[PDB]
Design a protein around this ligand. Structure first.
Ligand SMILES: NC(=O)c1ccc[n+]([C@@H]2O[C@H](COP(=O)([O-])OP(=O)(O)OC[C@H]3O[C@@H](n4cnc5c(N)ncnc54)[C@H](O)[C@@H]3O)[C@@H](O)[C@H]2O)c1
Ligand SMILES: NC(=O)c1ccc[n+]([C@@H]2O[C@H](COP(=O)([O-])OP(=O)(O)OC[C@H]3O[C@@H](n4cnc5c(N)ncnc54)[C@H](O)[C@@H]3O)[C@@H](O)[C@H]2O)c1
Ligand SMILES: NC(=O)c1ccc[n+]([C@@H]2O[C@H](COP(=O)([O-])OP(=O)(O)OC[C@H]3O[C@@H](n4cnc5c(N)ncnc54)[C@H](O)[C@@H]3O)[C@@H](O)[C@H]2O)c1
Ligand SMILES: NC(=O)c1ccc[n+]([C@@H]2O[C@H](COP(=O)([O-])OP(=O)(O)OC[C@H]3O[C@@H](n4cnc5c(N)ncnc54)[C@H](O)[C@@H]3O)[C@@H](O)[C@H]2O)c1
Ligand SMILES: *c1nc2c(ncn2[C@@H]2O[C@H](COP(=O)(O)O)[C@@H](O)[C@H]2O)c(=O)[nH]1
Ligand SMILES: *c1nc2c(ncn2[C@@H]2O[C@H](COP(=O)(O)O)[C@@H](O)[C@H]2O)c(=O)[nH]1
Ligand SMILES: *c1nc2c(ncn2[C@@H]2O[C@H](COP(=O)(O)O)[C@@H](O)[C@H]2O)c(=O)[nH]1
Ligand SMILES: *c1nc2c(ncn2[C@@H]2O[C@H](COP(=O)(O)O)[C@@H](O)[C@H]2O)c(=O)[nH]1
Lengths: 384, 384, 384, 384
């Protein structure tokens, strides 16, 4: 009976790799490409992995994927597609309040099989919308609330402000049933103020986005993986989920963001130039392209005698096809990643991470080269 | 559903204190008085604590207490008392083989209520006996095996020898059903050789005993708490329990030895001058005393023209009363200690320790003074 | 204008010594004698130091001193004396509920000048009382509430239990206006559970008391200075004050406990054998003495067939005179200590400590010897 | 009253990121791109940020921007433009003394709206001029003093020399009212000698300039961010401001230099190929360009048989437009950066930095890639 009595089953496991706490205690400003998750023990098949995810304190999704509130990413079409694949879309506010409300209404009234489709308590697709922290945003909010919006995100580069805190309080007084997402934040100190003010989730990231130049221009921000880990670890103490926002370039980045403590992942460029994204396709040197621009680029700010300091750029992204084809690929990828690290659900991934059972490893520059494609004359990379 | 979905229950727990791995990675030669166990969460009562303990790979006891094979500690009387209170005694070999075998026979034929009493498969009290690693010990072993001994301990200060390894192999060939305890060892390197040779448990400790001067004379040994932790951590990988032997002065020391990975605790001085211990009581300045001596003292070695290098001393210990009164006090103490640290069983204490959930703290010299009785003119310390 | 413009006043200050965060990040189990506070800048006189202190979330005292709920320390006489000198006393519960309630009534109805005297909203002296976590303590609590008690302390060695959490909830439901002190705790993990359950203050300390042997017997506890710093730092986040309890031997210890984050300091032995303490004076070899005993000593437990594991001892303490003479000395000492470290109030001491402005230094053993009296043939130590 | 009494307001702030002292204690030779400033708490608008800056002990500017004394950067036109936008220009000395004095006189006699325009006590634009440390520089200094120059910079790659110290003493004897800037220095040891000799400011930087090859040729220099932090921290003790000189490529670099302790920032390439810069525009492959060269390049040294060891290169820089359009953009950028990090003035930025309230983070190579523009097919970067 010694085989059981020494340690209560709870067998010996050789200690290899670093816990997340150790990896991010080193003070290096790590981001996603700087580390790997070590593989675990596999006892099940990839199709059994559950991706149920908390968007806010009270809104639950079938998948962890959400589309960013950007005028080249999310309108009613994108919101409908993401809700049907089991996520959610946030409708941008670079438009008039009535226009934005009409987009919300199209999503709320919408209606080749969608077992994961997100619904509210009335069998309607959920829809989010963005607002600012200026005075006219109160009227915009009233119209959105009337359209039946399910959650609003307070859209700012630096959410730890008197303006955002006042707006949060105004909302939680006038609309007690509305869920509010605050941000963007990258530190626990910012997160504390926003959680004290009553947000139901946090949007995490500053300057990591593909179109962002805030770190270069204003010298302020944080490496994204560290930002996600630190804010998630703080917000977990109060039961507040975090949306990891910016710098997602592939399925591995999604999996890493979730393993570091995020509950949902927001995507910009990775959903741009899909069919459901707004704007028209164009051609340049034989490649199909669609515009994709920062909300702080001059063109986006000139969308309605003083210096305007641009914080984003305006570019183009290559065609990706349909959301209905692309999102299943991401889902299958995340499921395979969970299987490799030995977890039956995203909830269990994060539980293993906080308990120290999940292990990580740094990657030097040579290790990143080794990790990519190398030593070939030519190749084709087809993902699915 | 976020309250569950973020981390799967598995709530936030502030990080305070050191894991055992961290405490013993510091390289300080710590022993028992140098550290404390931090308190945990209490959900049950002390009388519900289960003290079931593995003595060997195949022998299980109701309590973790065993009496040392010393000619001032354990003969048939002590062995019977410890078996009745739920532990075991090891009969010493500073005597003729027929004498030792007769002691074993008295224990095996023995027979105010003993629900914890240790039994074998034939409703008989279990009994251990010590042997050396010289040639005549083979004949001594034959007699002990005929008397029906349940386990033998190979009695040496430094068990990692060709002599002990040969004796272990001889025993495991001639008596395949006999359990063998090897030792004493204080390092993983020694433990590896003995476990490879096929021992069913390890006796841990060198120079920590109350009567021992081996560290002073031969400069060889180890601080006991470190020795127990290191050897237990190695032996756990192969399912081999360890007996922590030497330097136990009180119930806190017992609890610490068990929390560091030991399965059973051996006691010398703490059981000397009990009524069941051999030898007669005497008086010296109005105090009742009984002799207690090291097996490597000159008097013990003169018990059967060359230098004899003594490794122990010969002294006297104050009267303690009956084993039947004293052992219940130790049991109640260990149960209260487990309750304070939040464990329902010794198995769960060790599981918590290896998983990092159990936390520890060092104690400076001022901290040890603060921990003891201080700032009083006089006092009486009555333990139970 | 550079003299101002470079750093906004905020002059250069050479970096010397360790912040508290650094001192307690080292992992050594430090207690009070292991460190010193470095002196600061003096701009005022000692008599201007304000000692206003928070006892609970809603009870404020003129001084930080409280008397322990022990049957050799605090009854109505001690409670009246401590309330008159600007602190508070907690009446012990090693007595019948009616007896305890009568003590509370004597304090509440009491009535050579006391500008610091503690009062409640009705110009009555405040009074605390201790209760246990067993079922009959509910009836004891009802009687105490009727007597008009202002605060109750839940009296346990290990407060992080289902029993204490249930009792706290029962109290906060039946008596919403009663302040409740939970404990004893020594870790942030324990503090989290108790703060979540709704305590208004925390009692900190396990095994540090002069009469305590818990660390020796049960191996569980913590060095007191570390315990105070860690729990205070956690409890500060939720606005919960801590009472530092046990191991206070002099004014320097009081000052250190307050600088480490405690709001009030509890005293046992240091108030025993005062005139107001219960029990009679006796003589032993020409010294005047009074009994002082742990609440977990056998005699205290035999105050009304099973092992009782003692956790305290029973001793005697030398006569100290009157509380009305002794407490002013402690007050003057604390004020001088604050002046030396450059703080106008205890609140400002703790603010400096948390901001890193207050600096500390470790003391080796030789440093502690040098710090005490040395190099003399004889001496008299008269404190005031 | 506990909410105030525990810590005196002075709320809890989660500890995230590194202080500047910690960031530069690591011994890595960091420069600007290696780190970020973490965002703080915003309570005000960007247009309220005050950029008042100390140029010397006694000269104060409305903005922290100064133009470098280089013959492709600063003559009378540039000096007038920078003084009108609230900064200052230093006229180069690669010319005859009478020529340089005539430039100074044009600035001193000069005359939209310029609310920030720098003035002296006589309502005249301030003007600086560079001199060397050779004997003929004494006569050059006499002419400059007669032209009414307000400050002189002693122009050297390595200012910690007997020549520079003698020249400083000569100046402070013959012209007690003239402000003197010494440099360039990169270490506290050099700064000590120059401050002891009586300089009123320090020019910091060696080899970081865009046109500089000193680090490659002579192996001597320092990474610029470390140089600025170290020298600023030393010079602050004596009330001496530092000008951060070299390697400024964008607004984020300016903000970082100021947050590390610099009072003003000097710019070379970033002001070259402006309209006010001397030299003519030319075309090369359809791009408008203007020459920009190091003062230690062969062409600059051949401006008046022996090896000349070049320390700079000679190149061309793309057209930037007018100083009057470009400088407002930098000003607005610096103000937004201060707002993001939560400071109402540059003085407050540095106060937060020295007090440990301002926090920083390192950036790995992957973090720098993530910080830039990525994951796009094409883009346009328009800054304002
Ligand atoms: N790193 C990022 O995540 C990031 C970075 C840059 C821009 N963006 C995006 O670009 C867009 C612009 O964001 P932004 O940060 O400029 O936010 P914003 O437009 O709300 O802020 C503009 C400026 O006005 C101030 N302001 C805000 N509310 C105010 C009020 N009520 N009264 C007075 N002043 C007020 C802000 O503090 C800020 O200085 C947003 O959509 C944002 O999401 C994101
Ligand atoms: N620290 C401790 O735990 C400790 C220390 C000293 C003594 N003791 C006790 O004192 C007693 C003395 O034991 P010991 O350690 O002296 O061991 P031991 O009496 O078996 O050995 C005595 C010496 O003889 C050698 N030897 C052993 N077997 C041999 C063989 N077959 N052929 C040739 N040489 C052989 C040993 O290696 C050793 O040098 C034991 O009861 C022991 O438990 C214990
Ligand atoms: N280090 C210290 O601070 C310290 C140490 C020892 C004793 N003491 C003092 O001595 C006295 C003894 O306190 P104690 O710690 O023994 O606590 P206690 O007397 O309340 O508990 C005795 C035992 O009964 C259990 N128990 C408590 N409430 C229960 C309930 N409702 N149902 C079932 N079981 C319950 C406890 O968990 C504990 O094991 C107290 O006055 C205490 O303050 C203090
Ligand atoms: N890293 C930089 O900041 C940097 C680097 C290289 C060049 N520069 C610039 O290029 C130009 C060249 O400057 P430099 O550093 O060559 O200094 P410099 O021209 O004054 O010195 C040239 C050499 O002559 C020596 N010298 C100087 N004064 C002397 C005296 N009175 N008597 C005898 N010898 C003397 C110097 O020590 C040096 O070895 C300057 O405008 C400088 O600002 C700057
Ligand atoms: C910086 N960041 C900006 C800007 N507009 C939006 N954003 C942020 O980027 C995210 C998208 O990043 P991708 O990497 O493309 O997925 C958005 O969600 C938002 O947080 C901007 O102008 N400057
Ligand atoms: C050193 N150690 C010795 C000797 N004889 C026995 N022992 C060891 O001491 C243990 C008992 O220690 P206590 O602290 O009294 O409980 C024994 O079990 C054995 O391991 C000796 O001569 N020298
Ligand atoms: C251990 N600790 C005990 C016991 N009774 C009370 N206490 C604790 O000691 C404190 C007093 O300590 P001093 O150092 O004398 O001031 C009490 O307040 C309580 O916390 C006991 O039996 N065992
Ligand atoms: C090295 N450094 C040189 C030389 N001439 C001037 N300088 C330095 O460079 C600064 C300008 O740097 P940018 O990065 O263009 O702004 C000047 O202010 C001066 O310190 C040289 O020949 N070699």
């Amino acid at each position: 009976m010694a085989d059981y009595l020494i340690s209560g089953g709870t067998s010996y496991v050789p200690d290899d790799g670093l816990t997340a706490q150790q990896l991010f205690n080193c003070g290096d400003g790590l981001t996603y490409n700087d580390f790997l998750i070590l593989p675990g023990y596999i006892d099940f098949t990839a199709d059994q992995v559950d991706l149920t995810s908390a968007l806010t304190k009270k809104i639950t999704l079938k998948t962890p994927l959400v589309s960013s509130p950007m005028d080249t990413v999310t309108e009613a079409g994108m919101a409908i597609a993401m809700a049907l694949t089991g996520g959610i879309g946030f409708i941008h506010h670079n438009c008039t309040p009535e226009f934005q409300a009409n987009e919300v209404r199209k999503v709320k009234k919408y209606e080749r099989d969608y077992p994961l489709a997100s619904k509210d308590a009335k069998k309607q697709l959920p829809c989010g919308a963005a607002i600012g922290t200026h005075e006219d945003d109160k009227y915009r909010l009233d119209l959105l609330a009337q359209a039946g919006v399910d959650v609003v995100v307070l859209d700012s580069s630096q959410g730890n402000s008197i303006f955002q805190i006042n707006m949060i309080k105004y909302i939680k007084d006038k609309y007690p049933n509305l869920q509010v997402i605050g941000g963007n934040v990258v530190t626990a100190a910012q997160a504390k103020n926003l959680i004290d003010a009553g947000v139901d989730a946090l949007r995490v990231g500053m300057g990591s986005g593909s179109i962002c130049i805030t770190q270069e221009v204003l010298a302020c921000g944080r490496p994204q993986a560290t930002a996600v880990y630190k804010v998630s670890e703080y917000a977990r103490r109060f039961g507040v989920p975090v949306i990891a926002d910016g710098g997602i370039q592939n399925v591995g980045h999604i999996a890493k963001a979730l393993a570091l403590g995020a509950s949902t992942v927001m995507m910009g460029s990775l959903l741009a130039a899909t069919t459901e994204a707004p704007g028209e396709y164009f051609f340049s040197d034989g490649i199909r392209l669609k515009k994709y621009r920062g909300m702080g680029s001059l063109d986006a700010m000139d969308k309605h005698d003083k210096i305007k300091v641009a914080q984003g750029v305006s570019g183009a992204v290559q065609d990706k096809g349909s959301i209905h084809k692309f999102v299943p690929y991401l889902i299958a990828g995340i499921q395979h990643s969970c299987q490799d690290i030995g977890a039956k659900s995203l909830t269990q991934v994060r539980a293993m991470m906080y308990s120290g059972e999940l292990k990580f490893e740094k990657r030097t520059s040579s290790a990143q080269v080794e990790g990519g494609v190398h030593s070939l004359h030519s190749y084709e990379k087809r993902l699915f």
